[model samples]
Target: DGRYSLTYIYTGLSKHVEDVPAFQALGSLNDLQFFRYNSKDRKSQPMGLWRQVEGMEDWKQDSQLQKAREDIFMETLKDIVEYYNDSNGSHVLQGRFGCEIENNRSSGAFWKYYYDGKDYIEFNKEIPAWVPFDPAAQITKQKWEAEPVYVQRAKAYLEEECPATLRKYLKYSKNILDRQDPPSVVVTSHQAPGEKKKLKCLAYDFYPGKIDVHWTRAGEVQEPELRGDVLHNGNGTYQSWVVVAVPPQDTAPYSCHVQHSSLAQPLVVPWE
Candidate 1:
């Protein structure tokens, strides 16, 4: 709950993960591991020392694995920084290193190698990292002077060490069918009694764009649906809504039903 406003979500798996059930976008099975990170800090918090396991039934937390992983990261980071002659003795450098691979179209890593949770240097990019500093000024004054070299080095490392891994994530992503992530459900009844009872359902933060929202009152499904076209959230997810007016009392048990390919079963949210 006290995590940074900027977060990075990552997953490392032996194979490409499953999609659907929305809860576990990469599916819940295999030697799957997830990482939650703050852009400007070490992920050494409670969730920092935890990982989720896959059982095909549900995601499970594994603290032991998390501890071991953090220990490895600390040890490895220490040795590498020292080798680079960048570790000031008795001084601590806080940051995060995240790497992920999913499908051919998706494969990258991120690092926020500074404090205040920003000023991250993204080594992996389709193009050169844009330097916003003054072109007329000396490179020494620019904090990210070594970004060009840093990016080159990161690209080399990923290409040399992670080709097989990258291919695996893509291979699995190809087989994953379209999924429906559950949407946020809410209701409002600020109208007076003479007005028809209005049930409002807003659905968003899901994928595949297509969705179905229906209404049920007193166990009977009925509709004079006013459907809204699906719209993009600009982060690769979709949203839409369906509004239905019903002539009913406040005590009526009205429920909203949602169906999408990402769902194994329909989601029913009630408004009474």
Candidate 2:
């Protein structure tokens, strides 16, 4: 039972690719993050967040209508959040409430509620009936009532109110998938040989930005105290870089390994 700032993604879409009505799912950051809907795994968890610094203005407003969506969602879930608060007032709630509207107009809704990051209920299924009291049953009932109302409200919005917004989400996702690109990796070395040296591994211009970079020596993994952050390239792609101090073992081969969603395989660029 803990918490962090989060974003909720509620959507109406198809499980299959060839289905109709396009695809519609909106999250906290418009085109900042267009992803696979994966109706079977229709929920998404929060990832690392970002902000602007120096002369740049705070881009948090980039969320645009995403904040509006969450505001409505939180309002809808207020009763359920309050119920949990009063029931487990001493604990934090780690959870998300999500919904899916089928192209046929039917919908399903669920809650992934947790305590201490483990399930009181997991992935929408109820908790085990074994409990010290009827309060558990009461909680399940509240959860049951909680989800359907959200579904009805959300589906109705997608139909009667948010149609244009939904279309925008669909188009953005298509563009991201259609223009998928892999990262170009490079290494830079500073300081002369036989002295303390700084090495850098940079992976740039990749779509679907999430990536991992690490150092390896003679086939063994090394941490090298990586200090890097993924950043947008401002044209629907991402870049990341890592730095490490080159060790005194000169003969050992050292390389930076890059892993990304867009790549068919990981890229390994050796420090020259």
Candidate 3:
């Protein structure tokens, strides 16, 4: 019914830490992470809603592909470190590549690289070449640009295979991906006697991530002092909160307003 996407993120670390893998990869459909792989385990595994696709031949093939990518990713990371000539210090190399499909057609595609959390280079599909953001990135860009076949393969994958894969996965997980759960909201107050009060509007157990929660006084919108970030609950749901300050002993008819896709109309819950 809406846009769908297939994306992958690969991260390589120069130095390993306890409980952290030297190399890790994640596969996502739209905003949901479907699978993950790490060097420590040397295996690809389903995550969250994607576990439903297990025990299928497609899952096995996907795992094998991830393993192959893991090897290539590590080697590429080592080459990047050597190119920079900074093997003594810790660093990170990350790549995000994806394609989006909308209205039954390919909408956009992207492939980008980052070094030490800074933009390094991105692929320009029109030129089908790597556009470097940093001086160091130019070195890698030149090396990659020389490989005409590699650039062609990247363009083909993003324009064709990626969107096709997204369509396939969308059908495979339609029930979970298409479902939406509405938010449950609660308004609470915290204050000492004779002190200014803080009103907190919390909305939890919502699906699809996009939501709006705010405070209103006598039908006029009130800006919150603290706007909590919408955070994943790790089980395919999200939660957020907002806080507003009010004077002590004030009875200004305050209410919490919530807007979500699941609700046909906006929900207004007045503070009692």
Candidate 4:
């Protein structure tokens, strides 16, 4: 029903702190983090259901690949720090690359980097080139573009290697990645004797992270005064809320409407 994405984030720091790793990498499937690797342990450890992939030959190969990337990442961090003449200041280099698949077809891909929390450069598959966002990034862009094979390899990874790996991971963790949980809907109100009344429509305990919550009055949909962000509950579920204002003296019937993929039909909960 939706696209599936596999993303890897790499972070390199100029100077290591007491508890911070000089280099770190995180892997995620869709919105769920599945693995992490850091300079401290130098191991790519699986998270949650991703442990299913452990002990496989692929795991060993990926671990070795991550270690190699760690070395290059730290070296790149040092080069960038020296370029900015900020060797004495704390700085960060972050890179994120990933691919998305939909209905067994490659849908999208991206490779981007950031310096000190700002945009630096990104790979444009259409142009097949590195696009620099800042003056400092121009140098890296020139260097990367000079190596045409490097760009070709990046494109190949995004189009082939990344999606292939994602498919494998999905197969290994289907029970967690392919399951869905329906949402529970509720309507609550707040009012004072002479003030305008407020109705809040809340939807909670939903899986897959997407839901539609709205307030309707007298069979007509009403625009919400406020809409809360869909927030993760840290237990593989999500919650969101929407609020609407109602007149103090109004007696018109109101209802909270919820739409989710897990439900056979949309849910309608009337305010009581």
Candidate 5:
């Protein structure tokens, strides 16, 4: 894969345009797991994952419940985390990590990692899950004071639950990383035959930012005047377009050349 130039079209996951419910199958499905269809042509292995609200429903309501029920829920989660640490339950486990609540009533928390296998990574300390269900709490209750005592204690106990894995699981479950990162771009250009007289090639993804635009006629690189401009989208990224003029010739050798930091060789467009 490194042999080919990577064209980075890094578009992050977009905000849900519409999530209409009831009729459409996709809409009704709050959580989804796409199973790749079997294909002989592609030796690529099929894989998929979940897209749910995560353990939010039950966990969120844990603090707003009777003492006994809340204790049981946290205890169960703790046991599961502990078992994984001991290499017990189903996941087969990969590292030594555990779960603990940070802000029990508020519901905001984070996972803490220790060791992967060879060395202990050590916990980076506790993370509160919630800042209390308050919008104007800052103006009135003072940020830290808004949380209930028991809720705070619960979080402290279950503070660093799963560490990195928890975020990975949530990120996957949230479907946040659905779009793959754009391949490292090198060049983008189109092709044309001799009889056609001319071909307007399209240029595409140029990665790590720098792209030198050039045109070559008859295998020799031509220093055509390059034209380019930047375009911004609603998302926090930038896109650019570049074009170089082509010369008229009997056997017009044409190509768009792109030079970037990620590319060892200048990305040449089309065949010579």
Candidate 6:
């Protein structure tokens, strides 16, 4: 059998959605409605999904309800800030939530003191409308500057270093950058005093000195308590230990993080 005259074009997600069996960090979203963008560029239509506000959830499915989503999201972010501050023994206003709006849906990611630690850091970098290969960042006419490996390394870096609350952007931005490598980093994730089960998970960072490592719970910076044990190496970098005992079953995310120097704009790698 011979089939001929086949031409293909892709039309993304139809009018319906499905429920699945997995837990996603940003699963709090996806159930929301989306807005289509209009621009002279002709490529901005579907890319607007990321701009929809988070926390609005199912309200987006309705026209009237969607109008009030911004207020709901703000209240949600504020509530998160309050609980976060109380748990970390700090003031709410002192904490910053990095939220960058992209597409018509709210995209970008966040980096801030949502948990406990010293020199707490978090980043929600912007992924432009035209970043290539990104399923979440569906651009119509432009290409990405970096390759897929760059994107993979970036997402891996975040998973290894940053908080669970702030990793969604890295997944979306993966389609925007290249996934090739001469990686910027190599590091390890340490638990219990440092992570989910105090398990050891090491990774690397391309930009070294700028790195920040410590333990924390989500939305608040915990006071750093370190273990004096040391693992010394002849190499310039010295390995040390600490514990920020956030008991498991709590909704917080604890982690060990590092940084890198090799990134350009829009797509930032979070070391939660």
lDDT of 4: 0.86
In candidate 5, how many Å is residue 251 off?
0.6
Per-model TM values vs. the true structure:
0.34, 0.45, 0.85, 0.94, 0.25, 0.20
lDDT of 1: 0.45
Q: After aligning candidate 1 to the native by TM-score, how far in Å is the CA of 59 from where it should be?
A: 19
Instruction: Tell me the tens digit of each residue's lDDT in model 4 across 1-272.
Output: 46789999999999879998889899998888888899888887888767766542365567888999999878777878888898999999999999999988999999999999999899998878899998878878877777779889878999999999888877766677777888888788888878999999989988878788898898889999899866663688888899999997788999999988899988999997
Provide the RMSD of all predictions against the true structure, rounded to 1 decimal: 13.7, 13.9, 2.9, 1.7, 18.4, 23.0
RMSD of 3: 2.9
| Candidate 5: count of backbone clashes, pairs at least 3 residues apart or interchain | 23
Clashes of 1: 5
Using lDDT, give the best candidate's number.
Answer: 4
Clashing pairs in 2: 1-116
lDDT of each: 0.45, 0.49, 0.85, 0.86, 0.33, 0.31
Model 2: per-residue Cα lDDT over 1-272, one tens digit each: 11111123343221224543222333333335432222233332222222211211122443434445444433433444455565333332233443333342314434444443345443332332212122443564455446556545534543444433333333333343335678888888888757867778888888665678877887676766567666663566677887877656667888999888677788888776
Model 6: per-residue Cα lDDT at residue 255: 48
Tell me how far the alpha carbon of residue 180 in candidate 3 is from the true structure, in angstroms, after superposition. Answer: 1.9
Task: Give candidate 1 misplaced runs (Cα > 4 Å).
Answer: 1-114, 129-150, 157-190, 195-198, 202-259, 263-272
Q: Which candidate is the best by TM-score?
A: 4
TM-score rank order: 4, 3, 2, 1, 5, 6
User: Best to worst by lDDT, what's the order?
Assistant: 4, 3, 2, 1, 5, 6
Angstrom error at residue 49, model 5: 24
Per-residue lDDT value at 94 in model 2: 38
Candidate 3 residue lDDT tens string, 49-88: 6776744226667778887887777776787789878888
lDDT of 2: 0.49
